[PDB]
Design a protein around this ligand. Structure first.
Ligand SMILES: Nc1ncnc2c1ncn2[C@@H]1O[C@H](COP(=O)(O)OP(=O)(O)NP(=O)(O)O)[C@@H](O)[C@H]1O
Lengths: 438, 589
DNA sequence: TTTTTTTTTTTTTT
């Protein structure tokens, strides 16, 4: 019944290494001692733990002995447990006071304050097994990748590292923290999810905390509390939505680069979850180096349908690196003193296309447009320059527009089909997937 | 299962005797660690079955016959052996070859006896049920009691042998009740797939239609093969599933849908040039009339039209490519169209571009939905996932699309056809997934005169049959007259009569090589001429006919570049441009 | 002990 076999991997000492990893360090006082505080100080939420300093810290833990067991490779080979352990010890050395906490001020801050004060005080009357550590956090943990120029220490192969295609993505990559690159598509809107989630009880009260594990769970009422229980008959209990905590969740698919792919083989988009402070980080149609923990989430179901179990998996967000993110009037002041603002900047329009600066000349009128006017009643007199092109076939006039919207403020580059009637007139185009009728 | 070990110690003798397999065995065992010295190898081995009759025929036959009783211990034997190999610093797999067989058969037929036996079965790949990774081994970590805990899950599709319904739940707090966390990044997941194969349509016996059957692809076999490819697929044909008799449902005759597990999946018709061959490729490459030569051999029956032939080979190279940095590409592949009175051999001419060309797929008019457009397989198929599937033009990526009656295609298709050529991609909004996927393709078609034989009499305007931007993207429009010369007609007759009554295969072996080695880039010598030529066109070709654009000049680039690959010159040269100046004259006159 | 499904093809129609 469930055979069990030893392996070189042991969490026991690694925990200790994590304690010495945080709050004890120099090269980057250290970053792990007072920034952790600044989280407990409530000026910051995201805990950014770099694979960089895991490497440099193993430079402190090896070279520079005494030698220590593997980290970044053990990390990216598992990727999930290291947020449940490396982060769990953070509770121990976190600064107490910390500074200027107040209470309310913040809503629910007094709730949890008086949660554990009414908890300990109602536990003080009974004494005259505790709210889980994940309940009080208010900080997310984000690992970031090591490319790296200092990964060249080197551990060589162990670096991924590479932003491989989803075609390159494999089944052995389950439970592996990796880099992936690709376009954002459909980017589900941010929604709360859940975390513990304390449901109150009716007669003698108390409380119980149902862990939030997986994607779904069974709700429960009965009575757990010994006093409402068995007398009489059972204390009723309901969920308290202000006793709940919600981790931030926005799931977004990321499509393949399309040049990563073999010539046939339609693009394969992959499923990703967002958690935490990194919410809102990703917007539609955006290429990014996205690193994250990739885990199976079966099933619901179906079930006996699948078989084999055929996981279907998903990705969770960890880190985001996005490609391509007065003294400004002074930056303008070589142009102000340049003279010939109108003809010169008219030459500056689409410098690629040769000839017909007479056309660019009017395009210049467009980029600025203006000024409108308001008649005082009022009804606007444009104010807006509607100028059209002509002649054919190619001319690469498309380039004139192509650069114009690329540069001109709030531009829309369109065509006949192209932007439709409903591509121009707000209607009720049923929303695909996430619903509905947006 | 003492006999299970008997198959192994029988085959154990086969280990190291003969040892000719251990070379590649060791090789895997080395190149893996050589990638481990870097700064990827599959675990499985091709075994020519041919050798095994030289040890045990008594073992031989059953390998095909009852592989469930034979292949898993020899499977174990590969692993056993390789494990006995160095060094300390996985279940593996097999393929074989054939050397067949009974068991030689095509997918058109199968069962009864053919079931439960190793078989090689070949053909068209469709529709490509798309990839999802699959669960196999479970693992968990107890605390504080620690240790390491695990399960092993087995689907009916895994291995061969029937086994108890393992699925499907995590062991989850095995006694004593200690918490057990999933080991992710530990426990095993092999990817799985099910890929049907349609028998070749042309080898179909009668009016009866093509029948595909599925074959499961585990581990490596996935992503090896796209739809539409000719593939010999070998493996063991499983009897799978309940007979409807598992339950009261359903009371009926029907049942036992079945497929083939494993094994090899070879593509067929790349290629293999050795040395002695490519030495001929280059020996011929030295000769300066070879362009015309290669052109003539294209159409064994067909009369002349050598300018069209040349044009075709010019499309057969691909004419390189150049991708801008941080900007849109300059299309290098060549798109042409044929037009003329019926019996020009235009369709039949397309059928030559059917075989030598190394893909792509040809179509008669219709066509659609959106051709290469996926048209959004709906809904799902399967497990709640809406899916796309390879369309014609997509399947044709980096290959030859050909069209019978491009004039007879819908006006609605034409939209995406513009999208096929300039934009050179595929935009999909339909349900749906918004992917823009590369449509880059070499495309040639044929259109008949809109009205009768007036192709020659009427102006090109109204003779187009497919205006307008469609005309721009075309590198060449070829008017071919059915016009009569009795002088010519004698010639027309005799070769046509000796019909029913310089080598092409090598031409494919050469073209393929000229693609990857090498791209010519450019020299200014072509440039110092074709410019003069283009302006010469604009100041002249408008005193004759139309059209003229910058694009038609960009074809001078592509044309010259095509012949540049034909010379196998490391660079573009002036005389190649002279080949272009040749081709466009006859293009418009 | 039950699970869960709207495009694409063709059609007849003002
Ligand atoms: N050298 C040749 N030149 C022309 N036709 C040939 C030649 N050799 C054979 N043929 C025959 O000529 C016919 C060509 O028909 P073809 O024009 O290719 O089909 P099609 O164009 O689709 N019919 P249509 O659409 O009306 O033009 C076939 O029957 C060929 O076998």
């Amino acid at each position: 019944a469930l055979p069990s076999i030893q392996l070189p991997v042991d969490y026991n000492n690694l925990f200790n290494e994590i304690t010495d990893f945080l709050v004890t360090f120099k090269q980057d006082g250290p970053k792990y001692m007072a920034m952790l505080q600044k989280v407990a100080n409530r000026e910051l939420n995201s805990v950014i733990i770099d694979l960089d300093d895991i490497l440099q810290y193993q430079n402190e833990k090896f070279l520079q002995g005494t030698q220590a067991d593997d980290l970044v490779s053990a990390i990216q080979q598992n990727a999930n447990h290291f947020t449940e352990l490396f982060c769990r010890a953070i509770d121990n050395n976190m600064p107490l006071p910390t500074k200027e906490i107040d209470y309310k001020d913040d809503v629910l801050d007094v709730i949890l304050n008086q949660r554990r004060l009414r908890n300990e005080r109602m536990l003080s009357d009974r004494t005259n097994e505790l709210f889980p550590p994940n309940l009080t956090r208010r900080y997310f943990l984000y690992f970031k990748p090591l490319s790296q120029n200092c990964a060249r220490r080197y551990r060589k192969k162990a670096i991924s590292s590479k932003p491989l295609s989803v075609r390159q993505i494999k089944g052995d990559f389950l439970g592996q923290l990796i880099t992936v690159r690709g376009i954002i598509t459909r980017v589900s809107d941010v929604k709360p999810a859940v975390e513990v989630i304390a449901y109150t009880c009716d007669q003698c009260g108390y409380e119980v905390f149902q862990e939030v594990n997986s994607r779904t769970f069974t709700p429960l009422s009965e009575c757990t509390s010994e006093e409402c229980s068995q007398n009489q008959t059972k204390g009723q209990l309901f969920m308290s939505t202000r006793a709940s905590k919600f981790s931030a969740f926005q799931e977004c698919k990321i499509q393949e680069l399309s040049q990563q792919v073999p010539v046939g083989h339609i693009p394969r988009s992959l499923n990703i979850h967002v958690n935490g402070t990194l919410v809102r980080s990703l917007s539609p149609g955006d290429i990014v180096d996205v690193t994250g923990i990739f885990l199976p989430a079966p099933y619901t179901g179906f079930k006996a349908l699948k078989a084999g179990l055929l996981t279907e998996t998903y990705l969770e967000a960890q880190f985001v690196r996005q490609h391509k993110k007065s003294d400004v009037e002074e930056r303008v002041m070589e142009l102000i003193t340049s003279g010939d603002v109108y003809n010169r900047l008219a030459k500056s329009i689409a410098p690629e296309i040769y000839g017909n600066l007479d056309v660019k000349k009017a395009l210049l009128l467009l980029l600025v447009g203006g000024v409108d006017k308001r008649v005082g009643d009022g009804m606007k007199i444009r104010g807006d320059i509607n100028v059209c092109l002509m002649g054919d076939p190619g001319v690469a006039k498309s380039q004139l527009l192509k650069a114009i919207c690329k540069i001109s403020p709030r531009g829309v580059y369109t065509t006949g089909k192209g932007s439709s009637g409903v591509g121009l007139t707000a209607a009720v185009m049923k929303d695909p997937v996430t619903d509905e009728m947006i | 299962d003492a006999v299970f070990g008997d198959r192994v110690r029988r085959f154990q003798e086969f280990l190291d005797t003969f040892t000719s397999y251990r070379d590649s065995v060791r090789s895997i065992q080395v190149y893996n660690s050589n990638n481990a010295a870097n700064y990827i190898l599959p675990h499985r081995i091709i075994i020519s079955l041919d050798d095994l009759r030289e040890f045990d025929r008594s073992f031989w036959s059953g390998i095909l016959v009852e592989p469930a009783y034979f292949i898993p211990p020899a499977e174990k034997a590969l692993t056993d052996l390789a494990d006995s190999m160095d060094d300390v610093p996985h279940p593996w797999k097999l393929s074989f070859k054939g050397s067949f067989g009974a068991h030689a058969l095509s997918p058109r037929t199968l069962t009864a006896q053919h079931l439960n036996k190793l078989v090689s079965v070949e053909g068209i790949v469709t529709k490509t049920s798309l990839v999802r990774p699959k669960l196999i081994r479970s693992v968990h970590y107890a605390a504080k009691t620690g240790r390491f805990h695990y399960r092993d899950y087995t689907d009916a599709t895994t291995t061969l042998t029937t086994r108890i319904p393992t699925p499907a739940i995590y062991p989850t707090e095995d006694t004593e009740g200690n918490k057990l966390t999933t080991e992710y990044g530990y426990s095993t997941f092999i990817d799985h797939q099910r890929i049907t194969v349609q028998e070749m349509p042309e080898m179909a016996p009668a009016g009866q239609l093509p029948r595909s059957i599925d074959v499961i692809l585990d581990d490596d076999l996935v992503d090896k093969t796209k739809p539409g490819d000719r593939v010999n697929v070998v493996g063991v044909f499983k009897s799978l599933g309940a007979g409807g008799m598992n339950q009261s449902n359903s009371n009926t005759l029907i049942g036992f849908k079945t497929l083939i597990l494993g094994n090899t999946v070879y593509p067929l018709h790349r290629q293999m040039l050795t040395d002695f061959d490519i030495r001929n490729i280059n020996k011929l490459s030295k000769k300066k009339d070879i362009f015309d030569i290669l052109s003539q051999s294209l159409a064994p029956s067909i009369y002349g039209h050598d300018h069209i032939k040349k044009a075709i080979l010019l499309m057969l190279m691909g004419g390189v490519e150049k991708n801008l940095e941080n900007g849109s590409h300059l299309r290098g592949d060549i798109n042409i169209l044929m037009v003329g009175d019926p019996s020009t051999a235009k369709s039949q001419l397309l059928r030559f571009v059917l075989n030598t060309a190394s893909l792509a797929i040809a179509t008669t008019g219709r066509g659609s939905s959106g051709v290469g457009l996926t048209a959004a397989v709906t809904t799902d198929r399967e497990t709640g996932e809406r899916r796309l599937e390879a369309g014609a033009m997509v399947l044709a990526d980096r290959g030859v699309v050909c069209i019978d009656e491009f004039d007879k295609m819908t006006d609605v298709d034409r939209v995406a056809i513009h999208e096929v050529m300039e934009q050179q991609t595929v935009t999909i909004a339909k349900a749906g997934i918004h992917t823009t996927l590369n449509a880059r393709c070499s495309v040639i078609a044929a259109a008949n005169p809109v009205f009768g034989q007036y192709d020659v009499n009427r102006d090109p305007h109204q003779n187009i049959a497919l205006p307008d931007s469609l005309l721009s993207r075309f590198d060449l429009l070829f008017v071919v007259t059915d016009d009569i010369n009795e002088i010519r007609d004698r010639s027309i007759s005799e070769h046509v009569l000796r019909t029913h009554r310089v080598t092409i295969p090598f031409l494919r072996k050469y073209v393929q090589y000229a693609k990857e080695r090498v791209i010519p880039q450019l020299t200014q010598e072509a440039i110092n001429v074709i410019v003069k030529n283009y302006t010469d066109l604009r100041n002249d070709d408008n005193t004759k006919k139309s059209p003229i654009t910058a694009r038609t000049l960009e074809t001078l680039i592509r044309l010259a570049t095509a012949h540049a690959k034909v010379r196998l010159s490391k660079t573009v040269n002036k005389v190649d441009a002279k080949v272009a100046a040749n081709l466009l004259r006859f293009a418009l006159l």
